[PDB]
């Protein structure tokens, strides 16, 4: 089997991407944030505290003839940005782009933090990291990909995020019309539960490539590119007027600037992020100070190849017995 679904930016900055997901019988369609940095599929629901729902579409399990309470199971998750959610668990039928999994753990939110309430466009998350990170207790549950893997034509999914434009998530097959050149595959460590790999170095604009190993994760659920402070300083030093602002919480730059590209290494290959992808617009409405799309990881504890980096590529998440990542230009 295979599946194919369009993913769409939630706003003009590509702050995140939503993908429609069918849950239950009859189908209830919710728009979920596919997140290769986490492993829980959770939804706003009829159980969510009423004051914490503001415009989201909710899953109502009592209206699904295939929903069943997973007796005694609870979940609770905190994300790197400080947001969180928690609740109870049903199993139900879940379909993405024509690919159906029966018995998928659908984690129903009883509580969500303010940043989720305030984002009316995201109805929940669909985790695509390794199932070892799933938070369901006392019986950990599998991700949608893990459940589908054996039925898929090939045990893979691909991320093709657009720049200010829709893109595609495919399950079970590699669309050879979606990229240019060849796909370069690179080793993955699953020891932290992430799609963790090692970049071979970087370049700033037209500058020379610096060969240096950068360990980090391929994370569709993080907006920006978070890299070591040495690398980030080398980038922003090429932008007149750019500076790190403790009050804003990262590097800012004059909105009048033209930003240079940033290249990252994948083995012997190179992925080029155009400068425009690194502009996240005014820090506040009407400001002439703009927020940078490349930021220091020094306070995180891990480097993060988020959407800024991934949307410059066609990315293969290969879940074969030894997982790997593939990157191609497009």
DSSP result, 140-178: ----HHHHHGGGSSSSEEEEE--SSS-EEEEES---TTS
- Evaluated on CA atoms 32, 33, 34, 35, the torsion sign reads negative
Nearest by Cα to 31 from 62, 47, 10: 10
Of 39, 85, 131, 199, the catalytic one is 199
Domains 5-174 and 175-330 share a fold: yes
Domain 5-174 has CATH 2.40.70.10: yes
Q: How many CB atoms lie within 10 A of CB 175?
A: 13
The string over 296-314, giving b where at least 16 C-beta atoms fall within 10 Å of a residue's C-beta and e elsewhere, is: bbeeeeebbbbbbbbbbbb
- Pinpoint the alpha helices (H) of 152-305: 229-236
Residue with tokens 């993060």, as numbered in its chain: 304
CA 115 to CA 160: how far, in whole Å?
26
Tell me the CATH architecture of domain 175-330. Answer: Beta Barrel (2.40)
CA 298 to CA 124: how far, in whole Å?
29
Please report, to the nearest 10 degrees, the dihedral formed by the alpha carbons of residues 264, 17, 158, 186 taken in order.
30
Active site residue 35: yes
The string over 112-135, giving b where at least 16 C-beta atoms fall within 10 Å of a residue's C-beta and e elsewhere, is: bbeebbebebbbbbbbbbbbebbb
CA 66 to CA 106: how far, in whole Å?
12
Active site residue 15: no
Residue with tokens 């893990």, as numbered in its chain: 146
Q: Would you kindly state where each structural domain of the chain is located, as residue ranges?
A: 5-174, 175-330
End-to-end CA distance of the chain: 25
CA 18 to CA 10: how far, in whole Å?
6
- In sequence order, the 6+-apart residues with CB closer than 8 A to the CB of 324 are 185, 186, 187, 188, 316, 318
Pairing label, strands 289-292, 279-282: antiparallel
Resolution for this experimental structure (Å): 1.4
Of 14, 33, 35, 219, the catalytic one is 35
Which neighbouring-strand residues pair with 85?
A: 77, 112
Task: Tell me which method was used to determine the 3D structure.
Answer: X-ray
Q: C-alpha distances in angstroms, 37 versus 34, 101, 126, 162, 306?
A: 9, 21, 10, 19, 9
Maximal CA-CA distance, the chain: 60
CA 7 to CA 197: how far, in whole Å?
24
What's the token pair of residue 78? 């905190």
Pairing label, strands 294-296, 225-227: parallel
Nearest by Cα to 330 from 208, 170, 161, 154: 161
Q: C-alpha distances in angstroms, 217 versus 22, 32, 38, 58, 293?
A: 28, 21, 11, 30, 16
């Amino acid at each position: 089997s295979t599946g194919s679904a369009t993913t769409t930016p939630i706003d003009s900055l590509d702050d995140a991407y939503i993908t429609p997901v069918q849950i239950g019988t009859p189908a209830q369609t919710l728009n979920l944030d596919f997140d290769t940095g986490s492993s829980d599929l959770w939804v706003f629901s009829s159980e969510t505290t009423a004051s914490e729902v503001d415009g989201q579409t909710i899953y109502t399990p009592s209206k699904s003839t295939t929903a069943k309470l997973l007796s005694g199971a609870t979940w609770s998750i905190s994300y790197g940005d400080g947001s969180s959610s928690s609740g109870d668990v049903y199993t139900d039928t879940v379909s993405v782009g024509g690919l159906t999994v029966t018995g998928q753990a659908v984690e129903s939110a009883k509580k969500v933090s303010s940043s989720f309430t305030e984002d009316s466009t995201i109805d929940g998350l669909l985790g695509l990291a390794f199932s070892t990170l799933n938070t369901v207790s006392p019986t950990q549950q599998k991700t949608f990909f893990d459940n589908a893997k054996a039925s898929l034509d090939s045990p893979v999914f691909t991320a093709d995020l657009g720049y200010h434009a829709p893109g595609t998530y495919n399950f079970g097959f590699i669309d050879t019309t979606a990229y240019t050149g060849s796909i370069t595959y690179t080793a993955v460590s699953t020891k932290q539960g992430f799609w963790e790999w090692t970049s071979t170095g970087y370049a700033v604009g037209s500058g020379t490539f610096k060969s240096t190993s950068i360990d980090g994760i391929a994370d569709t659920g993080t907006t920006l590119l978070y890299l070591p402070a040495t690398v980030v300083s080398a980038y922003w030093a090429q932008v007149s007027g750019a500076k790190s602002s403790s009050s804003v919480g990262g590097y800012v730059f004059p909105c009048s600037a033209t930003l240079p590209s940033f290249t990252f290494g994948v083995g012997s290959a190179r992925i080029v992020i155009p400068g425009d992808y690194i502009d996240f617009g005014p820090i506040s409405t009407g400001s002439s100070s703009c927020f940078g799309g490349i930021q220091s990881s020094a306070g995180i504890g891990i480097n993060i190849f988020g959407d800024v980096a991934l949307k410059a590529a066609f990315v293969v998440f290969n879940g074969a017995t030894t997982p790997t990542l593939g990157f191609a230009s497009k």
